[PDB]
Amino acid sequence: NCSKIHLSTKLLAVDFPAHFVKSISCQICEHILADPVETSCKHLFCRICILRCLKVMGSYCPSCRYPCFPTDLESPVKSFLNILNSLMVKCPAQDCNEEVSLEKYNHHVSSHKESK
Binding site for Zn ion (CB under 5 A): 2, 6, 26, 28-29, 31, 41, 43, 46, 49, 61, 63-64, 91, 93, 96, 98
**Cβ contacts of residue 6 below 8 Å, gap of 6+?**
26, 29, 31, 32, 34, 46
Report whether 89 contacts 105 (CB < 8 A): yes
Query: Residue 60 touches which of a copy of itself, Zn ion, none (CB < 5 to 8 A by kind)?
Result: none
CB of 87 to Zn ion, least distance (A): 15
Interface with a copy of itself in residues 19-48 (CB under 8 A)? 19-20, 22-24, 27, 38, 41-44
**What does the alpha-carbon distance between residue 74 and residue 19 come to, in Å, rounded to a whole number?**
23
**C-alpha to C-alpha distance for 2 and 23, rounded to whole angstroms:** 19
Q: Least distance from C-beta 19 to a copy of itself, angstroms?
A: 4
**Which positions make up the binding site for Zn(2+)?**
2, 6, 26, 29, 31, 41, 43, 46, 49, 61, 64, 91, 96, 108, 112
**Which positions make up the binding site?**
2, 6, 26, 29, 31, 41, 43, 46, 49, 61, 64, 91, 96, 108, 112
